Symmetry: C2
Subunit: 431 residues, 2 copies
């Protein structure tokens, strides 16, 4: 039922929030976007680079552009959903911009919990608790608590960042449950690990510390159960497919755009890899008149993203009922008519960007930086009386169960800006 | 007439664009926002700091937050305007989110053309042509052409950045004329200089190179004439008052928030300066429970901005007819019941932030950096045959009248990222 999937509930609410009773100048879904923009975690993305460190390729700009693509996807699907289910507007008061706001807010916050250095950063945190100093806690943790650590997931840390309760601030940003549902691409716990090849089982979406929260979210949204055991799992909020397509589209096309502007990808490849995606719409005489490389590739990027947005909207509507029933097993982009071209683009980015020497060097350095901060925090946790460990406390974590302390340390190390992680690492090593 | 003020015209259009015939998933005003987000000038704000250089206080984040405040102001005024003038919706099809989109897009682009180093940067460019090397061109320029240079204005450069025609890309971002009108806080030429004490005459809003464009914009919007001579001037688009209030509100409250987080303003001053603005709404027990300084001041900031948004909306509606008639002589914030508290906040920021030693040092360094780049570009313009000047050409301006060349040099030097301006300065001096 879409009416339940479009929940305006916020954590702690004691009474229902009806869509028809909202002030449209203060609509819960749009407030969610504003709350993210002004949050300290989102602002910190100003000082967080992607794999390439050019000072003009931040995670902030990526997140902005993903939210813009998400708003467009949500608006377009929202208009068509209100055509399919007219009672949603005539009776319940939903409007097509409501769907754009939900997708836009969830897409804006997708990278908010990810550690520095990309997938290497997640992998370094996991290795610390699997084989590093952190393995000593294995026997003091449940299997699912330990799995949170050895397979630490930036998606699940984002959910924690958005919802974490603190003195004077219960519920974090207190986003609408529809937004938290659209945010949750992997609505399962850390265990069991990859039970199938379904896209929603590739990773997990919440830590044990947020299990009770997502239980409240899933029951309020009426998400369909995928497990009937104590290992909980649900079918994805339909709008999470649009959040994922926005991310897939931007990662594919914009990484390519960046690789060309940065010199990693020869410009001579631009047309060849994009011709299928832009062929019918490109004004070739306009393309040839553009004099700057950055202008030519941004034109191709806009055309390719527009093509993929329109197709993703149509794919969503073709499979809407399978998605609403939890039987859609793939991503929207997996069904694309351009899958072969998308794959060639992604593979070229892996070869020329993600496996470039500068990116490899940065990830190797990231492993040391994160491993050091985790060991410093964890030894300070185990012996908090020594003078050294008191200083580490004042520096890295000023102002609980063992698991709650360990997951908090991972969450705090993960959300450090690049500048503060390297600086603090430098001091703990004297540079 | 609001119907004309809400023009969807884009530069070069040969036929009218009726509001009632727009696809609401592709509304011209919302497209304007997206085009700015993806533009190279907006992305470059990632590498442009405000006066304080902390790496977590960019002009990008400021612009984002101003656009969020602007969207809220536009939404709220838009709803009330459609109540006052119901034919705008029933006959012409306008919706309250239309006004939010226009204000949001114009506010997002407000700082896009400003040079580095703030007002010192504008002043350094002006001094170069008034008393530096650039004074030699005085006699080759009209009075208004020369005034563009000696009083170089970041507001007018923003209009150029948004609209500048290039091979393969006529019209720049080609924003809706309503958005360009809401953008224009000073709808006059560089001469005459400050003809009155009206807020709209404090500066000017377009260079001679964009005069013909803004003439097209003002006639399409039906803006009221303020001069009947060859020195052209118009009354402000009413929505420009909301763009200005968003900027005024954010500059006042958020500079204060930054000054406290950065240590420049003692935290003990936070409540004293904000008590009048937040008194009725602050949950003092919640405030006392917040443990981090950044959390306490962001709570006060949200309360003060909400207070000022609500009041600014009411001030706009009280004076709507004077604004529509071009007889409103002040800013919206000038009529605020908190003017005295706002002034105390602004004065404390001037004393503790803008006059701090680190800010003074940066502005002094900015004068040298910009003066050097301007002299290098201008000597290369005057003698383009020498080997040195060919290298300067390849480095700073790869790929016209004397005035068009000089204003282009100012526009390009102004939009340089901090990193590229300092690096290029370093090379021209060998560091
Ligand atoms: Mg992403
Ligand atoms: Mg500003």
């Amino acid at each position: 039922n879409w009416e339940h999937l479009l929940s305006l509930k916020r954590q702690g609410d004691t009474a229902k929030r009806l869509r028809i009773e909202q002030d449209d100048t203060r609509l819960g879904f749009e407030v969610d976007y504003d709350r993210i923009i002004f949050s300290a975690p989102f602002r910190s993305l100003q000082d967080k680079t992607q794999v390439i460190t050019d000072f003009v390729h931040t995670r902030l700009t990526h997140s902005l552009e993903v939210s813009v693509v998400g708003r467009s996807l949500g608006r377009m699907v929202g208009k068509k959903l209100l055509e399919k289910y007219p009672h949603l507007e005539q009776v319940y008061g939903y409007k097509f911009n409501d769907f754009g706001a939900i997708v836009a807010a969830a897409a804006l916050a997708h990278d908010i919990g990810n550690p520095p250095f990309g997938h290497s950063g997640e992998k370094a945190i996991g290795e610390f608790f699997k084989n590093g100093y952190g393995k000593r806690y294995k026997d003091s943790l449940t299997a699912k608590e330990y799995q949170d650590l050895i397979k630490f997931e930036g998606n699940a840390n984002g959910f924690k960042v958005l919802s974490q309760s603190k003195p004077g601030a219960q519920g974090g940003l207190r986003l609408s449950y529809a937004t938290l549902g659209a945010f949750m691409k992997y609505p399962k716990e850390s265990l069991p690990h990859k039970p199938s090849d379904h896209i929603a089982d590739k990773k997990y979406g919440f830590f044990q510390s947020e299990r009770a929260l997502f239980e409240d979210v899933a029951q309020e949204l009426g998400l369909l159960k995928r497990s009937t055991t104590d290992d909980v799992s649900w079918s994805r909020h339909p709008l999470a497919y649009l959040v994922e397509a926005a991310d897939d589209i931007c990662y594919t096309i914009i990484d390519f755009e960046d690789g060309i502007n940065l010199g990693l990808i020869p410009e001579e490849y631009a047309l060849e890899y994009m011709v299928k995606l832009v062929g019918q719409t490109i004004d070739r005489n306009k393309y040839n008149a553009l004099q700057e490389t950055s202008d030519r590739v941004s034109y191709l990027r806009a055309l390719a993203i527009g093509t993929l947005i329109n197709e993703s909207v149509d794919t969503f509507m073709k499979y809407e009922e399978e998605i609403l029933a939890g039987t859609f097993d793939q991503s929207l982009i997996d069904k694309s008519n351009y899958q072969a071209q998308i794959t060639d683009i992604i593979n070229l980015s892996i070869e020329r960007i993600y496996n470039s020497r500068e990116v490899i060097e940065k990830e190797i350095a990231g492993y040391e930086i994160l491993s050091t901060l985790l060991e410093a925090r964890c030894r300070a946790l185990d012996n908090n009386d020594t003078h050294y460990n008191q200083l580490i406390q004042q520096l890295l974590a000023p102002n609980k169960s063992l698991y709650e302390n360990l997951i908090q340390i991972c969450a705090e190390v993960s959300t450090m800006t690049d500048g503060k992680a390297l600086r603090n690492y430098k001091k703990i090593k004297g540079l």
